[PDB]
From a paper:
Recruitment of Pol III to these genes requires the essential transcription factors TFIIIB and TFIIIC2. The binding of these intragenic promoters by TFIIIC permits the assembly of TFIIIB, upstream of the transcription start site, which subsequently leads to the recruitment of Pol III, the formation of a PIC and finally to transcription.
The structure reveals the presence of 10 TPR repeats, while only nine TPR repeats had been predicted. This insertion causes a bend in the TPR array, positioning the TPRs of the right arm closer to the TPRs of the left arm.
Author numbering: 131 to 312, 337 to 561
The structure:
């Protein structure tokens, strides 16, 4: 008689029908289809949560419809209750270990909740399933950094690199043979694209590496030697091994024409990109400035001068502030000073260090001017005081006692 009570109800749609549909199974508890009916209605009336708790129960009657949990999990993630969402996802995954979507989604709700041990052990898995997804690669590289392992995040991009070298050698030996047998060569790609596949290494990759060598802040000379080996492989210059054995950091500069072995190179090779993109070059500057080589770091930063200024202002600033932190003051002022011309940069952010730089070179006259401008926008004490110390050193005490108390 139960089956009749439910049947009459399920057939047709009215707001009284579906709750009375619950009332019969209210006598005795469990019907899987009962809930799937419930959710269908709650979803339509447009109130989200009741829809979730109905289905969220349904999924327990049949533990085995995992396409179903995945829906209940993405809905608990949509309604912003996470602990359910990760739990539902974890059933989808105990049923199906290879479900990619749910391992990923779950493992990034793991990230938001800040269980990294789980979220890492999570993206690692997807990266095992498919090594060639670039999104997964980044997401994994990132967690490694947040998890305070930079060293692992670097090896990760290094393999991608080598994988690209192995593959280029394959294609080069491939058509070195194709001409012997044989009117052009025909290389068989289906065999190549299957045999060596790893993700393309382009400048973006090398930049992502560069930033990883900064965050490490260790053995910074090894980082530089490598940024150069890779940047050199790109631009098909890997042929020239010698650059590995000189300190100058001299390639990627005109300095390379004073080179003994370079001169002897034929014209074909002499013409090839010896230049590197700016976001990376400013990163070699920083990376050198870490080793307190200001002479080399400077030659990199000086390259900002050849880029259209409005395009990279933020780099001028980052360099200037990097010199300020590295306590090289005479030079910082040179990468601060241009930001002044563009209106949006005139702020305490630029004005404080500019001044402090001047105060530090023992020219206090001009340093006054900036702390003043800086004090205007922002009412802060820390850098009003340092303005006293400036009115102190250039003006000696006579008629400086009034100013001090005034401020």
């Amino acid at each position: 008689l139960l089956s009749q009570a439910n049947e009459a109800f399920v057939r047709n749609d009215l707001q009284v029908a579906e709750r009375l549909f619950n009332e019969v199974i209210k006598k005795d508890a469990r019907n899987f289809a009962a809930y799937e009916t419930l959710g269908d209605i709650y979803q339509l009336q447009g109130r989200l949560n009741d829809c979730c708790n109905s289905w969220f129960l349904a999924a327990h009657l049949n533990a085995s419809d995992w396409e179903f949990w995945k829906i209940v999990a993405i809905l608990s993630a949509d309604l912003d209750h996470v602990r359910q969402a990760i739990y539902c996802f974890s059933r989808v995954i105990s049923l199906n270990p290879m479900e990619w979507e749910s391992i990923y989604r779950r493992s990034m709700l793991y990230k938001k909740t800040g269980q990294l041990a789980r979220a890492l052990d999570g993206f690692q898995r997807l990266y095992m399933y498919n090594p060639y997804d670039a999104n997964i690669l980044r997401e994994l590289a990132i967690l490694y950094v947040d998890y305070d392992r930079i060293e692992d995040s670097i090896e990760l991009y290094m393999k991608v690199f080598n994988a690209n070298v192995e593959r280029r050698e394959a294609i080069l030996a491939a058509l070195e043979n194709a001409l012997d047998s044989s009117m052009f060569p025909d290389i068989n790609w289906k065999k190549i694209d299957a045999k060596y596949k790893c993700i393309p290494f382009d400048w973006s990759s090398l930049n992502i590496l560069a930033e990883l060598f900064l965050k490490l802040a260790v053995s910074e000379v090894d980082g530089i030697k490598t940024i150069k080996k890779c940047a050199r492989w790109i631009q098909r210059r890997e042929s020239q091994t010698f650059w590995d054995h000189v300190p100058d950091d001299s390639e990627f500069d005109n300095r390379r024409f004073k080179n003994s072995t370079f001169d002897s190179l034929l014209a074909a090779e002499k013409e090839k990109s010896y230049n590197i993109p700016i976001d990376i070059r400013v990163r070699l500057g920083l990376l050198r400035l870490n080793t307190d080589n200001l002479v080399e770091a400077l030659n990199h930063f000086q390259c900002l001068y050849d880029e259209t200024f409005s395009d990279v202002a933020d780099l001028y600033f980052e360099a200037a502030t990097a010199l300020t932190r590295a306590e090289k003051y005479k030079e910082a002022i040179d990468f601060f000073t241009p930001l002044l011309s563009l209106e949006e940069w005139r702020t305490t952010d630029v004005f404080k260090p500019l001044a402090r730089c001047y105060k530090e070179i023992e020219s206090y006259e001009t340093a006054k001017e900036f702390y003043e401008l800086a004090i205007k926008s922002e009412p802060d004490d820390l850098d009003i005081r340092v303005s006293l110390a400036e009115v102190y050193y250039r003006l000696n005490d006579p008629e400086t006692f009034k100013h001090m108390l005034v401020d």
